[PDB]
């Protein structure tokens, strides 16, 4: 197993951890903010996924400071992850094209 496949797996694990903690911490941050909708665990988990994927349906979002702080970690974890899968797919295509010219 090459470094880039394990970084990928690692990031997918790490991202899942961030999605889970993020759910739990989002609810902890938002309860007590009048008007908040990010306040039960099941839908925070859905919220954290749509935040890490940057799909932003706008059905749920944080309205407190620490909720927003939690959100940023999820977006960056989400974006770095999906980006690392790409950097991993590129080293693969690049290695497979250097065997394809002998090198």
């Amino acid at each position, epitope marked *: 197993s090459a470094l880039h496949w394990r970084a990928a797996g690692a990031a997918t694990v790490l991202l899942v951890i961030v999605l889970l903690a993020g759910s*739990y911490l989002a*609810v*902890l941050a*938002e*309860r*007590g*903010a*009048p*008007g*908040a*909708q990010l*306040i*039960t*665990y*099941p839908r925070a988990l859905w919220w954290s996924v749509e935040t890490a994927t940057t799909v932003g349906y706008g059905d749920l979002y944080p309205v407190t400071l620490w909720g927003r702080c939690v959100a940023v970690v999820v977006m960056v974890a989400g974006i770095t992850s999906f980006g690392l899968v790409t950097a991993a797919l590129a080293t693969w295509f690049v290695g497979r094209e250097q065997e394809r010219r002998g090198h």
Partner: antibody
Amino acid sequence: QVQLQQPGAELVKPGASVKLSCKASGYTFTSDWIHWVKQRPGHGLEWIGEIIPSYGRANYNEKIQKKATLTADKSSSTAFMQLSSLTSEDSAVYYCARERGDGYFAVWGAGTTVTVSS
Amino acid sequence: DILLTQSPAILSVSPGERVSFSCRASQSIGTDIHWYQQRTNGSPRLLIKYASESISGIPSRFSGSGSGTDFTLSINSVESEDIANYYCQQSNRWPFTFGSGTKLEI
């Protein structure tokens, strides 16, 4: 089983305070929230506040005079509500309820009957 | 805060008839409404969660419908054990809130 155990009654002199308890059994998860609800005789249900015992954060109903302080003892799975400086407006039954973090109160205590009198 | 309105406050029905309790919320709350029964000198008991989902231990006789701002709890064929106060409760927005209550009268 009985999941929330509350004392049946407390008498409180006007101006004094009192600490209601609520011992939980059954499944206790780290996600669990303990809520407290006030019901004046012949009136309805009134949400007072909530605490998450694993972490210790508590939130209160801002719309009513904040008479309460919420604490919890992780060791004994017991939640405390400290009502202070009581008047006859505060005489009521106080239920505790358990919410799994999914928005509904699955189970309730039998409630404690707080009487403010001399 | 979300305000849950329960009108009418009392409901007179004859035995075996079907009865319906109305919860109206002051804004759309999806299906995040839940129904409780409270008999005389008892504590509240959960009947229906998330508008319509059944709780085990609860008679088939009890059902719920609704979404958005209009919510209904129904009892196909009332009987005497159903005499109580019935409360709704929302979990869409913080803080949770309760309806004012409806009494069932046979």
